[PDB]
Amino acid sequence: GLKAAQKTLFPLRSIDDVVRLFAAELGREEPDLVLLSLVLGFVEHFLAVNRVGLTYFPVADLSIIAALYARFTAQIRGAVDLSLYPREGGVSSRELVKKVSDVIWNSLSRSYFKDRAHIQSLFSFITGTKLDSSGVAFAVVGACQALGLRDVHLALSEDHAWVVFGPNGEQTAEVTWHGKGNEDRRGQTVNAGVAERSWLYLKGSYMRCDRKMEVAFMVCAINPSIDLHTDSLELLQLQQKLLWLLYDLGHLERYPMALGNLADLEELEPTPGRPDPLTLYHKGIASAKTYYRDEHIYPYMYLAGYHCRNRNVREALQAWADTATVIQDYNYCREDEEIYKEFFEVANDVIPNLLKEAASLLEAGSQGSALQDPECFAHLLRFYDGICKWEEGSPTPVLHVGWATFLVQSLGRFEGQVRQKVRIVSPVLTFQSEKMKGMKELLVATKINSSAIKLQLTAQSQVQMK
Ligand SMILES: COc1cc2[nH]c(C#N)cc2cc1CN1CCC(Nc2ncnc3sc(CC(F)(F)F)cc23)CC1
């Protein structure tokens, strides 16, 4: 190693002291990822993993943080000999990046729960020899910075992480695992995944982080959870303040999900004088549209979740329809299972529960109910249309009869006189999927033909013999 200027703020005695440290690092040529992750993991460990003895804030003494930093840098420098991998051009090689990845991987405990909380940071790597998937990729980037490899940067999709490096930062390399059971492609490019138009690789519209965005990633990666019931107020506040610092300095401009995280925090505990959560969610969506060709799903899911929690049914449906309008131009691939699970939950649990409550409130006399609004019925139909279109040309199917039951139920929540008002053109809606085009006459009928809907959604050819 640490430079003298990096040590002057220690000891860190409060949240605001940590925020100062992040401010100073972010004002530097290159913020120190190793330092910052070690601090965050330290504070998270003593605020969420083990709060014994806590009286206000776990003081971060320099002697402690410098010793952790020395354990990291020693481990990396000792195991990665740079002289074996000459840098033609001030850029790194694939072999060098692979060696760093191997080093991190080989340092990890043989067996542990890979999905635990609080194993994302370099503090976890040093003290527990444990990291989660994306934590490995972050550690590889941290290790590369510590080695002077200024070209190696973190790349992020909505459910995976890897690195970019080399001439013009144009190379990609896998450095960690994804999911559970996937035979890894460590050392390879992501170009096959890009080419198959999976959600996992975002058709190539993934985030290529600069150092400032890598700091934003570690801040999103703070995990305030103490247990299933309980969050650390101190960590929530630290994460919120750190996200505002990044925001003010411009470093969330290209980070849609960080804006959604900040909006969620503001909904929980709003900061006087700051934009509303809704404004923040829409800024996330604008970031996606500006930098990522509007090919991200979470900016709309964050918005829908907010509307859902606030029982803005119309606005939740619109936002879900918007998520489907994104997913429709992907192919559903092996390894996209996380987004399939989220779509499944929305269609088959969340929406039905919202419409069930809406129907009770309608019986009680609500006015302006989603169930009386043809534009809400349009949103519902646009949601299913994108899911159907997503499925077209995919190497695995999406829909099955489990989805059909909930579709029939959700349609039936709207009276025919409401459903009949939606104009399906070849409130006005255009269908992109052949499944929904063929369902058009069934959708606007007084009595919902349940069997015919099922047959159309699942393309089941035949009904019961006997
Ligand atoms: C499963 O989590 C969610 C499901 C949700 N459904 C709806 C609706 N309707 C809203 C909603 C919100 C969430 C919360 N989830 C949103 C995504 C967020 N993920 C992220 N947030 C910031 N940065 C990154 S980088 C990355 C890929 C990587 F982990 F590195 F491999 C993921 C990710 C973590 C929290």
From Swiss-Prot:
Effect on the protein upon substituting F414S: In MEN1; sporadic; with Zollinger-Ellison syndrome
Subcellular location: Nucleus
Record annotation: effect of changing P11L: In MEN1; no effect on histone methylation; almost no effect on JUND-binding
Tissue specificity annotation: Ubiquitous.
Reported effect, E234K: Found in isolated hyperparathyroidism; likely pathogenic
Effect listed in the UniProt record for changing G260R: In MEN1; loss of interaction with KMT2A and JUND
Record's keyword annotation contains Nucleus: yes
Domain of life: Eukaryota
Pfam families (UniProt xref): Menin
Effect of P256H: Found in isolated hyperparathyroidism; likely pathogenic
GO molecular function list: chromatin binding; double-stranded DNA binding; four-way junction DNA binding; phosphoprotein binding; protein-macromolecule adaptor activity; R-SMAD binding; transcription cis-regulatory region binding; Y-form DNA binding
Record disease entry: Familial multiple endocrine neoplasia type I: Autosomal dominant disorder characterized by tumors of the parathyroid glands, gastro-intestinal endocrine tissue, the anterior pituitary and other tissues. Cutaneous lesions and nervous-tissue tumors can exist. Prognosis in MEN1 patients is related to hormonal hypersecretion by tumors, such as hypergastrinemia causing severe peptic ulcer disease (Zollinger-Ellison syndrome, ZES), primary hyperparathyroidism, and acute forms of hyperinsulinemia. MEN1 inactivating mutations are responsible for hyperfunctioning of the parathyroid glands and subsequent primary hyperparathyroidism. Primary hyperparathyroidism can occur in isolation or in association with multiple endocrine neoplasia.
Subunit field text: Component of the MLL-HCF complex, at least composed of KMT2A/MLL1, MEN1, ASH2L, RBBP5, DPY30, WDR5, HCFC1 and HCFC2. Component of the menin-associated histone methyltransferase complex, at least composed of KMT2B/MLL4, MEN1, ASH2L, RBBP5, DPY30 and WDR5. Interacts with POLR2B. Interacts with POLR2A phosphorylated at 'Ser-5', but not with the unphosphorylated, nor 'Ser-2' phosphorylated POLR2A forms. Interacts with FANCD2 and DBF4. Interacts with JUND (via MBM motif); inhibits the interaction of JUND with MAPK10 and the phosphorylation of JUND by MAP kinases MAPK8 and MAPK10.
Protein name from the UniProt record: Menin
Organism: Homo sapiens (Human)
Lineage: Eukaryota, Metazoa, Chordata, Craniata, Vertebrata
